[PDB]
Symmetry: C3
Subunit: 269 residues, 3 copies
């Protein structure tokens, strides 16, 4: 694949949060989406603009201990400090012994591993997480990608009973990245939409046995994703997504997948 270079900033935010950003003062929670094709290399010029030690750890991708982002492998960043982390990816292939080497492709995530504790409980709690997508050659690309993060009892570190809305048009091919962090198990559910419990979130073809689901138990540091055709077989509407743990939904871990008709209207909303 291609070699690529980006800048990443860890920053303090209002209400004592902590974001990553591609640009200083544009830090988000979750952090910016990172999109890669199998075989790509990413060199990340990472600057800690905070008064506390921070790091960048990644799930699933290839990295050397020198890019672990852990005090253990001395890969964290002093306050004000800079470090360039290297993530590599590979494509699948038979090894020489006959066995199949799984590719790097999947729905993954990066997070701090040193804020609060040597496991980044503080960083994670404050908002130092975001999505990685590693694509395979042939994978179908979406019209948009939306990142939903169950962080303890919040979605994307928002004040509860205010979970984020996502706008789309019927027939649009919408991608969701679903990441979980903190202490608690959850179940992610979506009204009017289904996906496949497999790498991609859609069945490869008729030979794919993967269960089809609208509900998934997820624990801290689990990542999955899936694409749907917005409105497929159900029409336009305010389509609720929510944590299906009853106390979680009642305390307001809910948002709307707002699927507009072609004309721009929405039924009874």
């Amino acid at each position: 694949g291609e070699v690529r270079r980006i800048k990443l900033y860890a920053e303090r935010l209002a209400d004592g949060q902590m974001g990553y950003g591609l640009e200083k003062g544009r830090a988000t929670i979750p952090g910016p989406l990172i999109e890669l094709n199998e075989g790509d290399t990413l060199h990340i010029e990472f600057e800690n603009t905070m008064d506390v030690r921070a790091s960048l750890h990644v799930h699933g991708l290839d990295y050397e201990v020198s890019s672990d982002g852990t005090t253990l492998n001395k890969s964290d960043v002093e306050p004000g400090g800079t470090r360039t982390y290297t993530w590599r990816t590979h494509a699948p292939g038979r090894r020489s012994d006959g066995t199949w080497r799984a590719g790097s492709a999947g729905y993954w995530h990066y997070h701090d591993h040193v804020v609060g504790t040597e496991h980044g409980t503080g960083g994670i709690r404050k908002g130092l997480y975001g999505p990685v997508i590693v694509r395979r050659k042939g994978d179908v690309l979406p019209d948009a990608t939306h990142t939903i993060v169950f962080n303890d009892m919040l979605i994307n570190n928002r004040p509860a009973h205010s979970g984020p809305n996502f706008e789309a048009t019927v027939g649009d091919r919408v991608e969701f990245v679903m990441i979980t962090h903190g202490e608690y198990y959850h179940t992610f559910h979506m009204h009017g939409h289904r996906w496949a419990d497999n790498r991609t979130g859609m069945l490869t073809g008729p030979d794919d046995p993967s269960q089809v689901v609208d509900n998934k138990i997820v624990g801290p540091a689990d990542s999955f994703g899936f694409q749907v055709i917005a409105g497929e077989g159900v029409g336009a509407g305010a389509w609720m997504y929510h944590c299906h743990v009853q106390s979680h939904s009642d305390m307001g871990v809910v948002g709307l997948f707002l699927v507009k008709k072609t004309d721009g209207t929405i039924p009874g909303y």
Copy 2:
């Protein structure tokens, strides 16, 4: 792909519980099993006979906003009032864009969405849940079908140390639907039997790499099913099924898959 109509009533029961039934005063917990072939449409003539608002939301199957069963999409039911709910299904096909549309086939469930709160915490707690099986052309059909719901710390809203038993004979193709509800994660286990972590609960053949398990972690609104040849390779016996979370089995989330010999006997148990 045939169109169908059935009547469903929400009723308050004895001991302050709530349940769906196919007739008046015949409501069960779980609710009655709904079985569909892909393509089939089901129109549900639903009546809320209770003194509180109630609804019917479904997982997995195709419905419009007007069958969401939510406060949001004004698709819940006043006390005593009626509403006709529509669930469509679809077979798997090729989309124009060359991708594979998945198909509605799978182990699913229906549950109230307004009784307790705007997510029916109260309805679910009181027993407003039931199983839906959507079948695909060629799916092997069972000799019998037994629904097991881990709702909070009970099975099928029974008293504890009292979880249901299911009788069967050696060789029976027995189907289980396993639904989870409320606040707590669980692990469903079964002695003497195992299944595949996939759609049908059966391996398609030797090119099915899916994990063969007898123990599966589940949380609120998770649905799976499977089919076993009763007592396959293990013989007749009282075959325990139990939540494997230790305090959960200890407090009485246990039941018996009672697998009789052909002559109707069973080896001695307690």
Copy 3:
């Protein structure tokens, strides 16, 4: 495969209020010894309960009659100082007379006591009466070494917290992990620098295998999965943290090291 095997196995109290399975009197370990079988194999376990309380042997996944359930229910537990021969059987997958595919015994399985403390072995599990079982399919690739990580309540292999076990391998070694969970709590098992397949073997079969590829897996009491990695594949030598990813679990010390060595013997940054 297709061989009859015989072993002896003891239950024993240990130091610090613990109980262990062992191949010999006084050599009990926590976890108990790894039992490795090929599909078709029958294992006869000459079990002796050296302890002062009723203990059993119950196994997940494998084939056993109720006379080897090791339950109160089926009266197959063992009196203090008693001996009982448990029989585990295993079958290869095969086409059934109903045209369906019979799932094989092969996978990542476990054995635990069912009668110490409660009729669900709560006390026996807590105190260390658990061990791993692997059943191999014909032509399964065999590892260079096998390592067992049990998440029992808040600990690993009933060790004192902040001191989880380390495993040593050289870059290029085929390293197998058995990953069992017991007790009351859900966990997520994670490993730095390595990935596996959510499927029977923890390895994709080929390009036809849609299994999700994961470094993080939610597990609950009595969940068992396993996988094999090439040590340092595409990441190189190093101290490769494995940890529960439940933040307070990792904080309270549920961590260990996959110590992957360069070929010369060294570890960068040690």
